[PDB]
Design a protein around this ligand. Structure first.
Ligand SMILES: CC(=O)N[C@H]1[C@H]([C@H](O)[C@H](O)CO)O[C@@](O)(C(=O)O)C[C@@H]1O
Ligand SMILES: CC(=O)N[C@H]1[C@H]([C@H](O)[C@H](O)CO)O[C@@](O)(C(=O)O)C[C@@H]1O
Ligand SMILES: [Ca+2]
Ligand SMILES: [Ca+2]
Ligand SMILES: [Ca+2]
Ligand SMILES: [Ca+2]
Ligand SMILES: [Ca+2]
Ligand SMILES: [Ca+2]
Ligand SMILES: [Ca+2]
Ligand SMILES: [Ca+2]
Ligand SMILES: [Cl-]
Ligand SMILES: [Cl-]
Ligand SMILES: [Cl-]
Ligand SMILES: [Cl-]
Ligand SMILES: [Cl-]
Ligand SMILES: [Cl-]
Ligand SMILES: [Cl-]
Ligand SMILES: [Cl-]
Ligand SMILES: [Cl-]
Ligand SMILES: [Cl-]
Ligand SMILES: [Cl-]
Ligand SMILES: [Mg+2]
Ligand SMILES: [Mg+2]
Ligand code: NA
Ligand code: NA
Lengths: 138, 281, 264, 57, 264, 281, 135, 57, 48
């Protein structure tokens, strides 16, 4: 992602992450979707009844096409590391049907949503470094 | 100036719905945590100091490695090893190039630094006295050397730096020298319009910035005449953009470069590693 | 720009959106609140867990079919195993809570049906044996998040021991009154042509300031199909109903070891 | 012609700059510029969008 | 009464209406304008053709299918044969222009799909031979109003002479970056359930005040199906995409005989 | 500010008994000589200047010795001698470590200094031109070199120092770079919580600061290509904490270290020499 | 001595039972058998002399003087807040500085009881419950 | 921006400092800090203990 | 270990001979009944 690519020039990050979802079914499709952020240190959620104990939003599909779920800054350290690291693990984002998607006849029964990520205004990075995303033969 | 503090907020039960939007508008999501959770007050003293363009670009990056030698040359090929010429570019290496190419246009002064290293080619050919290097900037149009000791090195008007081996890495500043109001990192076009029924070749013409860019030539020699011992040298060229402005952000390079253009290589266009499942933590 | 149909509700780390609401009900016109010193009873400094517990918990979804007779839950019973709300409830002798109840049911402009959504104070229901009166087991009265279903038939048990469950008879609201009069209780209707959600904000309701949550449910939540689900291309279609409930202004007294109720 | 400016804070004051060269290109790094306007990229919309209002009315 | 969904745009003798818009984008928050005396370069009195050229030109429509990988155009290339704009462009060495881009795609409340509509400054694309770099013919780079299409496969040519066209590989945006990051460029989405049009107002963007329009395209216009077209009664259905573009604040310098570019 | 002066005092015969206390309280003895003897007036002009934390830590201490070589490498093992990488730590040596470990937490800027030395591996393989060294700081996540001449050394963003053999020891300052509000010298914990019935290995996991600390890597090379004469080099790394704050004092290390943790060695846990008798002057 | 810093989570986190010191150090033959603390009394289980433990906040229970010790502890860390399930902020050590003696019965035992109140507790990052490994 | 400060006395005046660098981390040693409060370690008791009074009353 | 999770006092035996433990008023009802009654049960006093 654009955020991921910028973070790979830095060692440290802090702040809130914004996840925005765009439903791209037909206008005739309805539904309720649960979007959850579970801060770390417990069983990763694989069921709605565990996911809904964390930070979450119930998204009602409708005229407003898009729903924003926040992963608010919830961390022991003041910065997390821009690497896979148990000590600065960030937790778990999951998604469940709250009801289900319902369509009438003559309507696609399968469809998609798009997920976007961006940094919030509380977000900053430190300690410039080379990225592992570009290299050349020698 | 600091990144955003978090205000104290409790819950809502309201016709105000900051959690919903419509990204069809071309607006990104705008909601912040205080819009969708109960928040405490947190004073944010942290700053975005290290992600300003000056901070992001504030590094001397290696952009090329040049080679020159000093020995008794008896063939045309060996005479051409006594000096080197390099068309000035940031496309010989990938790291600084990729950072610049987050942007379409830029304006900056340049700090150029050089690291010069030697080794003996052989033992039992005696020794070599300490070498002086000439690095001559040849602007477009100025005559290019054809030998290490031709008239061009008198450098009456071209800037030259004379570097003594073992001294501090040499360094100089270059102004913003662009003939436009900014440098173009990308140019969607050609150097000339090919016209109806002209006889000019259209089969072997190029496209983009390579058709219009010319920052001149760096020429390097060892000033010393040959010793019995052949010495081989590397000159590493470093660039730091300073006093930086940039315009029109771009997605960064996702796959290997294969030259000076945006072209990609058929065996290297799969940057993502497939996940086992859409549900993999 | 602002609409009776479009609403955001944020409590703690949880947000709900709806784009096809029909206003929102505040039961008896009263927002929930903390217990005032001039109405207080237990004298220990209460626990007010705030954002840990006062947040949206989503129950297991149920399926609305053309043959469904309806669904019931009790509160706080439905939330007894919900995160830190459940822990605060069972570690204390006493608790009080308001709620935001958000009932979710979307379909299409080609579906039809209407759900009555009722919040009933002291929702006492009939038992299923005529050998006894008021003869319901704790386990059957307190099903938790699964709740229960209504039936359109009353078949009381041959033996008293087999009838210790609710006779949830739909048209008598499981309690000997006509279902058509349930509108005297705080309610909304989810009429699929109009709206896809119901929102009810409930104050604490009781004859006491605070009470034993593990003994006593303050509210029933009833969802009755007033007009059956119909969909011309498939009369056997099912659409989910999802219930999401946030405790509000929770306050607990009488801390000790944890309550672990009987499961049989 | 000495400039005295605030240093970037460390673990636990001011610094002095004199320019020695007649060309600004010779100067050290530009001073920290905290300018930003993310909205030109994150919200480049003709009609104002109020976060609390519907995006489409 | 006034709505983010309902818009009228009038330029010269041409008007567009939409009843299902989603606001409008002004690229980088900057409306186009004429070139100020304090930023000017060529010194001849410029031609400002105004209403003759600063008006909506409708390109040939393209068909969106379930198998479409997307479409690209360059500007001012796409408008080079459009009425008096084309004549002013080719009679002058130098030109600058902003644009109103209006992308049109209606369907039904039963169709689904999403188009990303991106305006890309200096939209440089990869060539289709690995024997050379930056090896694209003028004719293939400048297709005019027909534009080009993306592919989901990269098949570079055996011979350099056969690969002098763009490798318009969809997921690398035809230029070695991931398409998911194209949102850093001024954009809208046509999501068929929400909107039937995208409107982008573009200022002149270049490292110069004014440039050779016949040599240099300032903008790429990219339309990518982010979510494929789907329609349950006919998966093979096609719906048109129509592109209508108005030059704005056009200014030309260096009048002479007309430029007639090579066609082969 | 000076250490305490002694006041003029004579004797006492009093219910005031400053000689007695009760250290069960957790208070140390407080009595001073004027409480228990007749004292003259002595003006104390002496100061505790040299025992301030800045004075105690105000020294460049050697923290490691790195090795690099320059020769024609024909095997994988010999190619790996042309450069070195070192995880930055103060635990390779004992002296600075023991001083820091008087404290639980610290905050300081760092002065890093390097001493670079060479010797000829052999005679009768000729000579070697003066060598330039690159010392590159690789922050966590930045790519690590696999060869002395790979792309990583172009160092566009990583800080590098180019050092010319025979020049003054190179030196730079590092800010307080901790991701916490202080450095932890001791961490009584783990990097992650192992959870009930998880399949993750619990048999080969570690404990304490080693599970969470990462200050990145120092990479060193000779920039020069090989001479006929093999040159072997040592790089001594020096650290001086400056602008120092420390918290929560600790008993100092009484027995030899045996690694990065607090572990002790069975043959080295008897620091005291037994006295002949409790009555030995 | 086959490894360094080689302690299991379960042995590091015994809970209310705590652990005991020993006056002998007997490191394990096999690395897998030594993943517990070497709680050697005179080295305070950490390679420093126990006589210097008085630099830490302390009291002494000297049976002739007192029957209790009271220590009020602020939060101490290099962070404002941290992962309690990963990280212990404080150790509590009780060392017999002078051995228990009772003339009528040298084998007598007297209880030591530890009572601890958390104070000014504050928690962030609510989710599902952490259930640590028990083996 | 010169600082003039007292030197540490020798066998038998002032010195001048100018900071040359924009980062405080570049600065020479912190000035002598004679701050101390031994009582936080030597006497961290809740109730004041007067030396002349009994420790336990 | 169960008793100490409730309202409690740790009594140190010494010169002050007597220790007071309170059962503070903690009840659902505003009054309890002066009979054995599950609804107005008062809870448990223990000593270890
Ligand atoms: C660049 C290179 O490899 N040089 C090598 C030379 C060349 O092979 C010459 O051809 C023969 O001297 O040979 C050596 O044995 C030598 O002269 O001592 C080692 C030396 O490193
Ligand atoms: C590091 C070391 O011990 N080097 C020694 C070498 C090596 O043994 C080589 O293998 C053989 O030259 O031998 C010497 O006799 C030499 O070359 O003059 C002495 C030299 O000090
Ligand atoms: Ca909104
Ligand atoms: Ca809020
Ligand atoms: Ca020469
Ligand atoms: Ca609270
Ligand atoms: Ca005109
Ligand atoms: Ca005393
Ligand atoms: Ca005295
Ligand atoms: Ca080398
Ligand atoms: Cl070299
Ligand atoms: Cl010359
Ligand atoms: Cl130029
Ligand atoms: Cl995976
Ligand atoms: Cl339950
Ligand atoms: Cl055309
Ligand atoms: Cl050496
Ligand atoms: Cl290099
Ligand atoms: Cl750190
Ligand atoms: Cl002795
Ligand atoms: Cl325990
Ligand atoms: Mg449950
Ligand atoms: Mg045409
Ligand atoms: Na702030
Ligand atoms: Na004194």
């Amino acid at each position: 992602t654009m955020l991921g690519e910028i973070l790979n020039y830095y060692t440290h990050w802090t702040g809130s992450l914004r996840f925005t979802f765009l439903f791209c079914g037909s206008m005739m499709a309805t539904g309720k979707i649960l979007l959850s952020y579970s801060p770390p240190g417990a069983k990763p959620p694989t069921t709605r009844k565990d996911a809904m104990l964390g930070t979450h939003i119930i998204w009602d599909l409708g005229l407003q096409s898009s729903c924003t779920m926040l992963a608010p800054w919830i961390s022991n350290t003041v910065y997390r590391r821009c690497i896979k690291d148990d000590f600065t693990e960030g937790g778990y984002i999951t998604c469940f049907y709250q009801t289900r998607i319902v369509v009438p006849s003559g309507t696609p029964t399968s469809m998609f949503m798009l997920a976007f990520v961006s940094a919030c205004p509380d977000f900053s990075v430190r300690l410039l470094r080379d990225t592992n995303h570009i290299s050349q033969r020698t | 100036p600091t990144a955003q503090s978090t205000p104290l907020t409790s819950g809502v039960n309201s016709q105000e719905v900051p959690a919903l939007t419509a990204v069809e508008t071309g607006a990104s999501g705008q909601a912040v945590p205080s819009d969708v959770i109960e928040t405490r007050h947190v004073v944010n003293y942290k700053t975005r100091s290290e992600s300003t363009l000056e901070s992001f670009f504030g590094r001397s990056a290696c952009v090329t490695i040049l080679e020159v030698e000093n020995f008794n040359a008896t063939t045309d090929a060996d005479r051409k090893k006594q000096f080197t010429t390099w068309a000035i570019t940031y496309t010989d290496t990938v790291q600084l190039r990729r950072k610049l190419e987050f942007f379409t246009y830029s304006r900056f002064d340049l700090e150029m630094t050089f690291v010069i290293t030697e080794r003996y080619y052989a033992s039992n050919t005696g020794h070599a006295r300490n070498q002086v290097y000439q690095l001559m900037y040849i602007p477009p149009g100025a005559p290019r050397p054809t030998a290490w000791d031709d008239y061009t090195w008198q450098s009456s008007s071209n800037p030259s730096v004379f570097y003594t081996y073992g001294s501090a890495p040499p360094r100089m500043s270059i102004p913003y020298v662009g003939i436009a109001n900014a440098y173009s990192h990308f140019y969607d076009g050609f150097a000339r319009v090919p016209l109806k029924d002209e006889t000019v070749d259209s089969g072997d013409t190029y496209y983009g910035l390579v058709t219009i860019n010319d920052f001149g030539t760096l020429a390097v020699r060892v000033v010393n005449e040959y010793n019995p011992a052949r010495i081989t040298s590397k000159i590493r060229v470093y660039m730091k953009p300073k006093h930086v402005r940039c315009w029109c952000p771009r997605p960064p390079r996702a796959v290997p470069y294969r030259g000076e253009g945006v072209d990609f290589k058929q065996d290297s266009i799969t940057p993502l590693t497939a996940v086992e499942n859409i549900n993999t933590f | 720009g602002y609409s009776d149909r479009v609403r955001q509700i944020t409590l703690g780390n949880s947000t709900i959106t709806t784009q096809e609401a029909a206003n929102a009900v505040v039961a008896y016109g009263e927002w929930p609140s903390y217990l005032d010193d001039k109405e207080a009873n237990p004298i220990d400094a209460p626990t007010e867990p705030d954002v840990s517990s006062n947040r949206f918990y989503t129950l297991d979804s149920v399926q609305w079919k053309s043959t469904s007779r309806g669904w019931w839950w009790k509160l706080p019973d439905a939330l007894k195993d919900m995160g830190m709300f459940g822990q605060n409830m069972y570690y204390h002798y006493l608790g009080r809570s308001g709620y935001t109840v958000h009932v979710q049911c979307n379909a299409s402009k080609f579906h039809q049906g209407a759900l009555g959504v009722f919040a009933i104070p002291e929702y006492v229901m009939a038992c299923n044996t005529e050998a006894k009166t008021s003869y319901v087991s704790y386990v059957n009265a307190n099903p938790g998040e699964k709740g229960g279903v209504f039936d359109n038939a009353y078949n009381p048990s041959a033996e008293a021991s087999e009838g210790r469950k609710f006779a949830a008879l739909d048209y008598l609201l499981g309690c000997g009154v006509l279902a058509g009069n349930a509108f005297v209780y705080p309610h909304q209707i989810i009429n699929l042509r109009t709206n896809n959600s119901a929102t009810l904000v409930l104050p604490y309701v009781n004859s006491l300031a605070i009470d034993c949550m593990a003994k006593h449910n303050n509210w029933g939540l009833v969802i009755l199909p007033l007009c059956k689900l119909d969909y011309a291309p498939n009369s056997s279609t099912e659409i989910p109903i999802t219930v999401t409930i946030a405790p509000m202004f929770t306050e607990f007294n009488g801390l000790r070891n944890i309550t672990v109720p009987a499961t049989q | 012609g000495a400039q005295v400016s605030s240093q970037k804070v460390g673990a636990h004051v001011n610094y002095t700059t004199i320019n020695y060269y007649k060309d600004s290109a010779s100067n050290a790094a530009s001073k920290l510029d905290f300018s930003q306007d993310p909205s030109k990229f994150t919200e480049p919309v003709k009609d104002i969008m109020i976060k609390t209002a519907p995006a489409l009315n």
